[PDB]
Design a binder for this molecule. Sequence first.
Ligand code: NA
Ligand code: NA
Length: 327
Amino acid sequence: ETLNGGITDMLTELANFEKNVSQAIHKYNAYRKAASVIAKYPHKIKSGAEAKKLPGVGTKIAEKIDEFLATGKLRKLEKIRQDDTSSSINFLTRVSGIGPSAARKFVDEGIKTLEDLRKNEDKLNHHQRIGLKYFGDFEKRIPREEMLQMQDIVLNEVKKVDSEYIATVCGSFRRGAESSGDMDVLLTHPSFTSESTKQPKLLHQVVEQLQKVHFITDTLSKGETKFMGVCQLPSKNDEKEYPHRRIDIRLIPKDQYYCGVLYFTGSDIFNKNMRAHALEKGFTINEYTIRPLGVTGVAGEPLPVDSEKDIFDYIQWKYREPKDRSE
DNA sequence: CATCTG
DNA sequence: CAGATG
Ligand code: NA
Ligand code: NA
């Protein structure tokens, strides 16, 4: 956790590159297991050889561990931090809708900056254009005080469209958190569940109210159960307009809401432990349901939930307010 | 995993 | 349809 931090960090650096710049998924996966194992590893790694002793740790990595332990640096690391190509890729990637792949193509056509991008808006798709157009806004965290304003709008709008909807804003917003990255709304309806053959209007209707009142400004991706957009708290009495924020709206069969809501609410560590405990209590859980575990090894059949409460009950545990869902 | 692009 | 992105 700090006893082999650098090592794990370099490894992580190295890995990112293999994957992002080279196309080296193998090597890429290579670095990861390695960090992963050195990460658990209980002692101070004093040498490459010592490391090698571990699984995932090979000759090449043991090598790198030496030079890094030997001198505060790694040549390779040094050469890669320079390399404009590598850096251009780490950079384009920051645009929403540009991934490694697109990054590579862009750079090889010589587009390596924001300006490059603007000049060449034509070679970019809808998501990408949008992503460029709000490069700034999108990198700006979202302060909780804004979140409560967004939430308030969304909830009131869904309500008007149909009293029967059930919307919930998950994420750390939910677990307390002072600011956040984007807004994720978990949506459900009584008239939509597991078997129920669809209802697309279910989602489309909401999305539409949201734009009607101008809260949603652009669409990134709009499916029949998942919507990826851009919203904006209306600018008050003009002088201060708000940054453009990312928003996710997802439709969920009512019969599996609280499991999602539970899940989406995180934190990742929270889930894990809860999940690991579930397993103890003769259960299984995932993003959609909780299932009684047979002894034949496995076995299913969806226990029925009415709240996040039901879930806890089942695994016989302390109902935890979102706030303490930390770890 | 769900959506989009080409 | 494969393949990319979030
Ligand atoms: Na990106
Ligand atoms: Na293939």
